[PDB]
Amino acid sequence: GHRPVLVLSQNTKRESGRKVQSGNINAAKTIADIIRTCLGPKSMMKMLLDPMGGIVMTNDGNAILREIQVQHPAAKSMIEISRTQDEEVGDGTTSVIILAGEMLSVAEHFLEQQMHPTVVISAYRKALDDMISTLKKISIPVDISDSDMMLNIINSSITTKAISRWSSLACNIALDAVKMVQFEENGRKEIDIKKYARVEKIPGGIIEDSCVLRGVMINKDVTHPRMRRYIKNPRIVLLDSSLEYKKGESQTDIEITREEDFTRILQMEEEYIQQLCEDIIQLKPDVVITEKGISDLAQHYLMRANITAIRRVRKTDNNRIARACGARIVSRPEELREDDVGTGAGLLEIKKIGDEYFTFITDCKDPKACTILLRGASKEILSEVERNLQDAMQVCRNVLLDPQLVPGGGASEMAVAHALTEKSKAMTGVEQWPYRAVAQALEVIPRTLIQNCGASTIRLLTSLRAKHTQENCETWGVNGETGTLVDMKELGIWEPLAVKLQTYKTAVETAVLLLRIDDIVSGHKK
Amino acid sequence: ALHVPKAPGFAQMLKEGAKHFSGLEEAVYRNIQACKELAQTTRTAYGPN
Amino acid sequence: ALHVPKAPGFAQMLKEGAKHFSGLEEAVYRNIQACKELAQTTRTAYGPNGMNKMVINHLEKLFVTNDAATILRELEVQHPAAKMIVMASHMQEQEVGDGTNFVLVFAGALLELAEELLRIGLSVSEVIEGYEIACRKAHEILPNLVCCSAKNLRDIDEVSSLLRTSIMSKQYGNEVFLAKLIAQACVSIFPDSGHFNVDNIRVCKILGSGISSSSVLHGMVFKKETEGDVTSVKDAKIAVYSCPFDGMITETKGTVLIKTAEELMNFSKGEENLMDAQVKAIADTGANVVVTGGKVADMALHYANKYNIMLVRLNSKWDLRRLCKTVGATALPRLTPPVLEEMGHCDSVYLSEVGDTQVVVFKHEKEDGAISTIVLRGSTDNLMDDIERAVDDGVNTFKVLTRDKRLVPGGGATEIELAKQITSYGETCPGLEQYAIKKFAEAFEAIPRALAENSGVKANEVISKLYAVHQEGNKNVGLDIEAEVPAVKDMLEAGILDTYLGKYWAIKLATNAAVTVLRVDQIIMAKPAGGPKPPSGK
Amino acid sequence: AAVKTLNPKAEVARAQAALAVNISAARGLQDVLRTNLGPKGTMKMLVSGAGDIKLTKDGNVLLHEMQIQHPTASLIAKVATAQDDITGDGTTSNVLIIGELLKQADLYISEGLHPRIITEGFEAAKEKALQFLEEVKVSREMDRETLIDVARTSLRTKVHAELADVLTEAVVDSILAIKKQDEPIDLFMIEIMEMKHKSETDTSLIRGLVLDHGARHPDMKKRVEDAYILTCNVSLEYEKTEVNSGFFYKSAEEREKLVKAERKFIEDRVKKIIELKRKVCGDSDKGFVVINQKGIDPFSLDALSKEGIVALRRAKRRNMERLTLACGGVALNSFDDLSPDCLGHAGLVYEYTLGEEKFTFIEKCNNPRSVTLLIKGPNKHTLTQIKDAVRDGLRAVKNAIDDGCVVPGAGAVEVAMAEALIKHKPSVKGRAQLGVQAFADALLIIPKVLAQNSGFDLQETLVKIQAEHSESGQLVGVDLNTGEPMVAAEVGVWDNYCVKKQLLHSCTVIATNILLVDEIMRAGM
Amino acid sequence: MAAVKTLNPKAEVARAQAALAVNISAARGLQDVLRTNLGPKGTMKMLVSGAGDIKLTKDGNVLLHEMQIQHPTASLIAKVATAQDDITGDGTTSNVLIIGELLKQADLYISEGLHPRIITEGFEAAKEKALQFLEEVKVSREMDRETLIDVARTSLRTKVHAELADVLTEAVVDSILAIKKQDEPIDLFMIEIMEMKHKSETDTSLIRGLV
Amino acid sequence: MMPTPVILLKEGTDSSQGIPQLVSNISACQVIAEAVRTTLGPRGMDKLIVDGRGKATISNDGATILKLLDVVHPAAKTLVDIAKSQDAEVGDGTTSVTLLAAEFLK
Numbered sequence A: 001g002h003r004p005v006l007v008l009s010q011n012t013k014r015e016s017g018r019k020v021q022s023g024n025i026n027a028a029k030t031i032a033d034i035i036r037t038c039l040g041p042k043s044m045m046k047m048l049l050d051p052m053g054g055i056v057m058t059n060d061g062n063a064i065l066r067e068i069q070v071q072h073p074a075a076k077s078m079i080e081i082s083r084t085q086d087e088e089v090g091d092g093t094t095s096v097i098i099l100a101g102e103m104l105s106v107a108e109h110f111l112e113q114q115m116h117p118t119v120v121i122s123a124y125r126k127a128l129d130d131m132i133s134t135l136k137k138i139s140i141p142v143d144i145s146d147s148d149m150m151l152n153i154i155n156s157s158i159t160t161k162a163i164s165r166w167s168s169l170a171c172n173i174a175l176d177a178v179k180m181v182q183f184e185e186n187g188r189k190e191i192d193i194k195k196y197a198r199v200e201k202i203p204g205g206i207i208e209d210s211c212v213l214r215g216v217m218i219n220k221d222v223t224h225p226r227m228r229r230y231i232k233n234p235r236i237v238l239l240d241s242s243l244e245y246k247k248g249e250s251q252t253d254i255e256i257t258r259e260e261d262f263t264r265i266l267q268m269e270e271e272y273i274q275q276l277c278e279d280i281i282q283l284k285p286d287v288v289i290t291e292k293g294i295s296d297l298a299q300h301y302l303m304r305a306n307i308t309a310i311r312r313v314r315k316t317d318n319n320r321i322a323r324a325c326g327a328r329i330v331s332r333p334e335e336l337r338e339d340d341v342g343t344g345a346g347l348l349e350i351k352k353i354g355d356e357y358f359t360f361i362t363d364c365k366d367p368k369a370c371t372i373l374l375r376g377a378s379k380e381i382l383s384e385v386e387r388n389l390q391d392a393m394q395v396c397r398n399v400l401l402d403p404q405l406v407p408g409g410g411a412s413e414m415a416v417a418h419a420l421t422e423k424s425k426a427m428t429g430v431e432q433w434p435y436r437a438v439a440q441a442l443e444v445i446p447r448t449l450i451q452n453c454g455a456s457t458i459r460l461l462t463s464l465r466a467k468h469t470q471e472n473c474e475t476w477g478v479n480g481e482t483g484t485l486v487d488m489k490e491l492g493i494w495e496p497l498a499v500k501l502q503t504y505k506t507a508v509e510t511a512v513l514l515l516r517i518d519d520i521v522s523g524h525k526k
Numbered sequence B: 001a002l003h004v005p006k007a008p009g010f011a012q013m014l015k016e017g018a019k020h021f022s023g024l025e026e027a028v029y030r031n032i033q034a035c036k037e038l039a040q041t042t043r044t045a046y047g048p049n
Numbered sequence C: 001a002l003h004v005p006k007a008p009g010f011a012q013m014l015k016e017g018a019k020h021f022s023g024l025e026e027a028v029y030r031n032i033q034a035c036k037e038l039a040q041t042t043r044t045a046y047g048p049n050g051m052n053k054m055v056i057n058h059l060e061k062l063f064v065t066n067d068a069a070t071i072l073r074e075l076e077v078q079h080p081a082a083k084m085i086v087m088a089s090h091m092q093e094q095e096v097g098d099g100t101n102f103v104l105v106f107a108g109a110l111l112e113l114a115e116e117l118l119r120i121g122l123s124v125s126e127v128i129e130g131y132e133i134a135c136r137k138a139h140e141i142l143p144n145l146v147c148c149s150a151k152n153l154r155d156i157d158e159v160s161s162l163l164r165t166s167i168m169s170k171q172y173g174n175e176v177f178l179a180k181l182i183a184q185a186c187v188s189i190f191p192d193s194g195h196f197n198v199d200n201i202r203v204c205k206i207l208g209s210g211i212s213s214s215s216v217l218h219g220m221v222f223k224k225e226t227e228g229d230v231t232s233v234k235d236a237k238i239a240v241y242s243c244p245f246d247g248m249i250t251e252t253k254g255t256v257l258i259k260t261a262e263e264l265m266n267f268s269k270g271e272e273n274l275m276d277a278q279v280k281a282i283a284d285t286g287a288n289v290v291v292t293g294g295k296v297a298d299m300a301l302h303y304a305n306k307y308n309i310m311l312v313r314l315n316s317k318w319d320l321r322r323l324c325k326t327v328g329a330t331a332l333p334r335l336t337p338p339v340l341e342e343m344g345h346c347d348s349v350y351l352s353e354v355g356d357t358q359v360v361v362f363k364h365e366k367e368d369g370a371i372s373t374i375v376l377r378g379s380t381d382n383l384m385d386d387i388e389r390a391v392d393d394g395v396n397t398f399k400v401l402t403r404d405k406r407l408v409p410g411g412g413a414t415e416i417e418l419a420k421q422i423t424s425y426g427e428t429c430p431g432l433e434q435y436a437i438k439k440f441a442e443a444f445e446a447i448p449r450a451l452a453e454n455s456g457v458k459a460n461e462v463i464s465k466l467y468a469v470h471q472e473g474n475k476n477v478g479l480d481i482e483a484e485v486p487a488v489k490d491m492l493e494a495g496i497l498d499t500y501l502g503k504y505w506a507i508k509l510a511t512n513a514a515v516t517v518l519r520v521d522q523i524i525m526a527k528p529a530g531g532p533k534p535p536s537g538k
Numbered sequence D: 001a002a003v004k005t006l007n008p009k010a011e012v013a014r015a016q017a018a019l020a021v022n023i024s025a026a027r028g029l030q031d032v033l034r035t036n037l038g039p040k041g042t043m044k045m046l047v048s049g050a051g052d053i054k055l056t057k058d059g060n061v062l063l064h065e066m067q068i069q070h071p072t073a074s075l076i077a078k079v080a081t082a083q084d085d086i087t088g089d090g091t092t093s094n095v096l097i098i099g100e101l102l103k104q105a106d107l108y109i110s111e112g113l114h115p116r117i118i119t120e121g122f123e124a125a126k127e128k129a130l131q132f133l134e135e136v137k138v139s140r141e142m143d144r145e146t147l148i149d150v151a152r153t154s155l156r157t158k159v160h161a162e163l164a165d166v167l168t169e170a171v172v173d174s175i176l177a178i179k180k181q182d183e184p185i186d187l188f189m190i191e192i193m194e195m196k197h198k199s200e201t202d203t204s205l206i207r208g209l210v211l212d213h214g215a216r217h218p219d220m221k222k223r224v225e226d227a228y229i230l231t232c233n234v235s236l237e238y239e240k241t242e243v244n245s246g247f248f249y250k251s252a253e254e255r256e257k258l259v260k261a262e263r264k265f266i267e268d269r270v271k272k273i274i275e276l277k278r279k280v281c282g283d284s285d286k287g288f289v290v291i292n293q294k295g296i297d298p299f300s301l302d303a304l305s306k307e308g309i310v311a312l313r314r315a316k317r318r319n320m321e322r323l324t325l326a327c328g329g330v331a332l333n334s335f336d337d338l339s340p341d342c343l344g345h346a347g348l349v350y351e352y353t354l355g356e357e358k359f360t361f362i363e364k365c366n367n368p369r370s371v372t373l374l375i376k377g378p379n380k381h382t383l384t385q386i387k388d389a390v391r392d393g394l395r396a397v398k399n400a401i402d403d404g405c406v407v408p409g410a411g412a413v414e415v416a417m418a419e420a421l422i423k424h425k426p427s428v429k430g431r432a433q434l435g436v437q438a439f440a441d442a443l444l445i446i447p448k449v450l451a452q453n454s455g456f457d458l459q460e461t462l463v464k465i466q467a468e469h470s471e472s473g474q475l476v477g478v479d480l481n482t483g484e485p486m487v488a489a490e491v492g493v494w495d496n497y498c499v500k501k502q503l504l505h506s507c508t509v510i511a512t513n514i515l516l517v518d519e520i521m522r523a524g525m
Numbered sequence E: 001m002a003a004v005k006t007l008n009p010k011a012e013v014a015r016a017q018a019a020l021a022v023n024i025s026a027a028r029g030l031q032d033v034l035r036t037n038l039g040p041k042g043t044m045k046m047l048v049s050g051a052g053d054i055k056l057t058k059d060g061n062v063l064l065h066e067m068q069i070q071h072p073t074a075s076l077i078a079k080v081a082t083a084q085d086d087i088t089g090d091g092t093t094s095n096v097l098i099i100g101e102l103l104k105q106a107d108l109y110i111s112e113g114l115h116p117r118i119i120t121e122g123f124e125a126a127k128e129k130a131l132q133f134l135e136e137v138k139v140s141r142e143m144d145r146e147t148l149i150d151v152a153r154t155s156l157r158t159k160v161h162a163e164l165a166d167v168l169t170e171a172v173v174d175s176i177l178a179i180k181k182q183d184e185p186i187d188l189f190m191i192e193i194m195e196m197k198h199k200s201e202t203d204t205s206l207i208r209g210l211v
Numbered sequence F: 001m002m003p004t005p006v007i008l009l010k011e012g013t014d015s016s017q018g019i020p021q022l023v024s025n026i027s028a029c030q031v032i033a034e035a036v037r038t039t040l041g042p043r044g045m046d047k048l049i050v051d052g053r054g055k056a057t058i059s060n061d062g063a064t065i066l067k068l069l070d071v072v073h074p075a076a077k078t079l080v081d082i083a084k085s086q087d088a089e090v091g092d093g094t095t096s097v098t099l100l101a102a103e104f105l106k
């Protein structure tokens, strides 16, 4: 016997000192190196094996990072910041990771050179503030009324994905969807593309046939074949309550003693259904769409009035239809009003694609919701196309909200680095060295672009750095396709200011978070 | 769609317990890291102090 | 240099338990070998001199029989080419009812000769084309080989003679008696209308007195006992009910709501009076026998006993429907008295003791009726099962005769004549298909060879004599099994005949199975699973 | 590796390893599926884990039923699944073209070339090839002969010659029967019914419906000559109240009264049906058939059979529309207001019994817009193979009717496409000409595989065909009986234009995406 | 799965196209490993034994012995390279590369249904023609000191560092010229190779005697 | 015999064919007859059979003794079946049927 006595429980480890900092920085560098080669217009794609047996062939950094599992907590923090960048702005996920990895890599030097992490953190925060100032300075305005400028911005956003082959069609689709989704009510502007901009993937066909509809498409068919599958100018009526006969909430029981009470009860059930159908018909609609089941007898009474019925649509699909055709979902048909009747859909067609029926409510006038019908080679191709379309729509929304633009291809990075170095020339304290280190660490984006392009990093980067020292060279970047220095006033690669601001903020703050950390303790039970 | 097979050629012909590190990142950086670690272990015994 | 790695490509991507067979040697020859093995297993039970086989299935149920279809069914066949040949045999059994062993033997012979042709140089496609051409030629020749027709199916003696050949292959020792039994049973059935139903023939197996004590009854026999006191009637007026012999109740929910003492005291008396009135109303129509498909109430049983009414409870709805057919009644869904047209009639219903089991007999006297039953006596359950299989074969033969009345000589005469004619045709066909046609002709030799081997004589002498006699011009000469030496005799005179449809369908199905097996070039077997069978198969 | 450093139990293939793995998988799939192409191909035999036998020749079925656990194989299987779902043909050609594109690309990648240039060449070659395919298509009025030719060119590749000949007539007649002018063809209106009692050549087309269920009452007539069809979706069995009624009685007489009075609701609808039947046909000459999507209890069955009415219960949901289009009635969900004008008409209704299963035939319809295909065979695998073949044939005929054009087959179209691509190659700038050449060589795989399956050699047959095409300019294919060049237009070897376009698009897209994959991970655990 | 497996169930067999695939895959793997060795611009390889001994080399034969390979075709190619090294002492990497490329080019046509026998016949004819061309193209020169220095450089530069190779050139040329007798075979056993571990790598030299 | 990678019957299937299996069947019938041989005649003797649960059965009836024996030999079970048949049809002679049948076979 005599079991050992000790302060902390077993399986409780603890390491401290330079080892923890080095391990955290190495984990961040490994996370960066995982997706270092997936940046730029010449990025290669990666194939990821889902544990559930799926395959994710993707170029996006966030999907790659979220599809892998790590044990080191610093890698978990890096994945979390990647997800945060993806959610906040939409793109820039594989740039912020690289930036954070480089910043931690250059901070490791000062950590090893007897400098306390707090000084490094203060220098990092001053550098971040000056980066924000420089980006706000070098930005240019954009008028959202010019469709060509918006298309160019979306193209520059999607030149690095696999959809650059059909870039023109993709940009048109994304811009149209964002414009359709844009809404304002009660003075509250709203661009909510995660609910009212739906992407539907139907494998087969050709990618060139993909388009955005002026309406909503659902995978539903008429309840009864006698119903019309083609109505010219339908009057939409939406419901979210069953058209059947159902038990009440209170516990209720009948007690039948007379002979004719059973038939009377059944007849009153039928009459209740008939009354509901008559209440619906009194508005004289053309179709009825419900989120809950519709009884066969109700279907008969609806067909008697020449009304097409769709049985069970989802909540989100019903909301999209309401936004598109101008209807208003109601629960009790007794309280139906003419305002709730959905007029504005220019055509309702129920056609067959492949071996399945699909319902189209397209041709709407002024629709506030849309569906993007994607057709392609297979499921994974369509998934990647959908991810690229999400990136494009997020970029379009960011530009619509924040109409300033900054040069791409590392031109902004080099301009900010040069401005930071010029400002650091004036400081005299010990904080200047980490400040300049961050300034030059910001140059990783053009270096990675040159490395991915296959060109030589050293001389190209040196020439670019020399070029940025002149009076007006803030728009000089690199070609990701030819490996040459070009003015981005000519190449036309521009990025939203919000995306760059979010990227720099997230990278610097992740570096700050991982610099503060020491004395890792693990193994304790909840 | 649940396992990544070894690439045909040298990867398959490699012995059971052997290891093969090739390229810059896999070999040169790892060797530099190991040498840095050794120097770090020995560093604190340098000089009169 | 101590291991051979798997070849890159499909070999490495194959699953752990899967097997892949490609080419001639790995797939076609192996399938031919498996089919040959199956044919060899079933070969020894062919013909009248075939020997029974004891087969123990996975449930330790013992089967002793010489029926090829049953033997294949009870065998755990795992090779899938043999599985295809077994499906062909079972399809032959379902379509015709006899000739399954012929199908298996012909398929095996065809596949062996195809293997020989493939070895000598012929391609698979050429062999398949030649086999199809020879099968078409054989189907063209076959109608010309018909020697006689049934020409009458209402006769007892002639139908017995027709079915004697069919039921001589199984139960060789005593086939005349079974011929008389099955002929009487089938002649009672098969009314003026041409349609004949196999299901109308019932078989009841009762242990004890040997198969020579079996008989045919123009009615139905049920192995149970009467519910009431009455055990025999003479002028039965059966009223068949599909409902339980009890007062029907509500389908929603029954609740006796009592609110006064008088209702409580009167409820049981009223219910009993209602039951008595219903039973008396049923009896007043003249019905002295009542058959019900459900539970029998005690009060209903008492009141049926009071009015001298026979009660019989048939659990199976198939039995109730068959009784309705054989008596001439309709199963009333409620307990209302039957009107004159829906009250069945039987010449005698009584409780009887046969051997050990208690039976209820619905017996007619006139030699007709919708359903007739055959009671099988014997000393062993397996023996009666074999006799039942023979009876099924005879009934299927009678049904085929009703379908088509043409007959062909048996005992290998038809096979030998077909082989001779197909060889003569193939000798005149130029090109590589002549080898396939000749091999298809030679495959017909497997039937007389199997018969000669089973009878204990030398097959080569029998086949040589058959060719000699057929070349002389006698097309109705086959093997003579009643001899200790290879000998032949005219089989039209001997009365040994085979159904034309049986031979036609057997040849067609065997050729189709052989061609289908030959068409296979690659096999990809998944890893065997220990799953509890597909849900559809139950 | 970085991933293995972060996750020790993770599998990684990077740089040339990923390309080698993907190309090896594609080559293995291609090698397996080479023998499928063409009518001279070899039947594959598939045994499942439960011992079920599957005889097939389709690329998609083979892909689904091979015991393969490879990622690239999964991607190609999904591509072929989409190909089959939309067009219904070209899966084997899909796999062959993907594998040959990957092999030809590797032939240049192994010499230091970068995959991006190959992908650019592939894109340019695909654009030119689509232009040429648009140029070469034959716009024709789809009469019966052309549809028969297309159905033959599908079914002969799928099944035996005589079976294909029968299925051609069956499929073409069925499609022409259900087809409405300037209206999309609905393939749900063709029942594919299986029966297992005759030879494979007994498959035929019935101008009506075949139902896998018959009358459940023995007293109902088994054959009705002149019938009136009442297609309904009304429950004719006892239904309990939704609100938990229950019965309360104080004596046996009240129990009897409540038992008699609880059937009144269903009895009313049965009486309505009986009154309609009596009014419509006052004699015994005409018949009355009731097909119900819901159950019919024995009481209603007896009540109907006492009036000489054949009642079928638990019919299929699509059978409502099938009977409405074929017989010509109105599917009723309630008997509130039923009139003789909603009754369908059938010129013959009879029941066929097969073993323990029963079937109902509804033939001699006036103008059946929906028909059925009766698949007959002695085995289950034969039935499955015939069903797959008729699916392929129906898809081919529907595609031929939809797209008014049709493309010459027998390998001519891709030979001409490759020659045009070679001619156009100098117009491509840079080193994308290597990708264009690889695309042309990959397109040339189909005549090669056809030559092998016919028993010939690639080099001689291919050079003969290409020389004939260059000298004459016609669309010359592969004669699988002699190997000589042959113009597929006269002999009637046709291919679907949509199938070729989908093949080009999907193969190019998937090959480009696979070639650009440089790193494979399995690190989700 | 084959005839052999029936007689011996525990047998591994590769037949027909599988045999060619296995052999060509092994040859291509060996070629891919040994591509980086060729030329003075080749890359040094680190070879660590089971005991932990470190060997740095770029020699093809030395690498072939130290590769952790257990393939039959690799064994055959290693035997061929060993014979090359034993008799001539150079060209092992060239052997591996040429064999791999020969097999790859042959497969490039074999995959098109061509029989390997025709390829082998073409190989024999091409080998005869190439031997004739090699005979006519050779440069017969009087082996003075400069030519021997050039040959020694062309070998050592591809074997070691440029400066060390430069020193070893004079070392080896002077040794050979010292032990060589006129119109007699050269006995390489008469050149002692002794290792000392106390100076820099450029301190190696030749001694007119014995150590 | 050869391994035959794909086998026809399920693995573990036992097949016996020819004269030896018939002789074995006759021997099994002899063994079955011997178990009830001494229960015949006025000088017969009783047999005590104990089941798995420990309950004993003492009987001179041949059919009872044969039924209490757990005979699994397919050919030997025919003697038990005919003894039960004789018991059902007649009720006496269950010992004589087995002796007669086994003696015929011998």
Ligand SMILES: Nc1ncnc2c1ncn2[C@@H]1O[C@H](COP(=O)(O)OP(=O)(O)O)[C@@H](O)[C@H]1O
Residues within 6 Å of the ligand: A038, A039, A040, A041, A043, A060, A061, A091, A092, A093, A094, A095, A096, A156, A157, A159, A160, A407, A408, A409, A410, A449, A478, A479, A480, A481, A493, A495
């Ligand atoms: N044609 C181009 N030439 C040079 N650089 C480009 C080009 N297109 C995009 N870039 C640069 O590539 C970056 C986008 O790469 P991407 O893979 O989208 O990374 P992220 O997903 O982090 O945005 C942008 O910062 C932009 O400056």
Ligand SMILES: Nc1ncnc2c1ncn2[C@@H]1O[C@H](COP(=O)(O)OP(=O)(O)O)[C@@H](O)[C@H]1O
Residues within 6 Å of the ligand: C045, C046, C047, C048, C050, C067, C068, C098, C099, C100, C101, C102, C103, C165, C168, C169, C170, C409, C410, C411, C412, C451, C479, C480, C481, C496, C498
């Ligand atoms: N008395 C007989 N003499 C000669 N041959 C006979 C006689 N009776 C039947 N046969 C032959 O035996 C064959 C029947 O074999 P059988 O055991 O019934 O196999 P299956 O059940 O598959 O038909 C018939 O082809 C017939 O020619």
Ligand SMILES: Nc1ncnc2c1ncn2[C@@H]1O[C@H](COP(=O)(O)OP(=O)(O)O)[C@@H](O)[C@H]1O
Residues within 6 Å of the ligand: D036, D037, D038, D039, D058, D059, D089, D090, D091, D092, D093, D094, D153, D154, D156, D157, D409, D410, D411, D446, D450, D477, D478, D479, D480, D493, D495
């Ligand atoms: N009678 C024929 N003669 C020559 N070539 C043919 C003939 N029939 C079909 N083909 C060619 O063979 C190919 C058959 O391909 P198939 O096996 O149907 O593959 P998939 O099912 O994937 O379409 C077609 O591309 C067609 O061009």
Ligand SMILES: [Mg+2]
Residues within 6 Å of the ligand: A091, A092, A093, A157, A160
């Ligand atoms: Mg981006």
Ligand SMILES: [Mg+2]
Residues within 6 Å of the ligand: C098, C099, C100, C166, C169, C393
């Ligand atoms: Mg028989």
Ligand SMILES: [Mg+2]
Residues within 6 Å of the ligand: D089, D090, D091, D154, D157, D392
């Ligand atoms: Mg096809």
Ligand SMILES: [Mg+2]
Residues within 6 Å of the ligand: E090, E091, E092, E155, E158
């Ligand atoms: Mg050398």
Ligand SMILES: [Mg+2]
Residues within 6 Å of the ligand: F092, F093
């Ligand atoms: Mg006694």
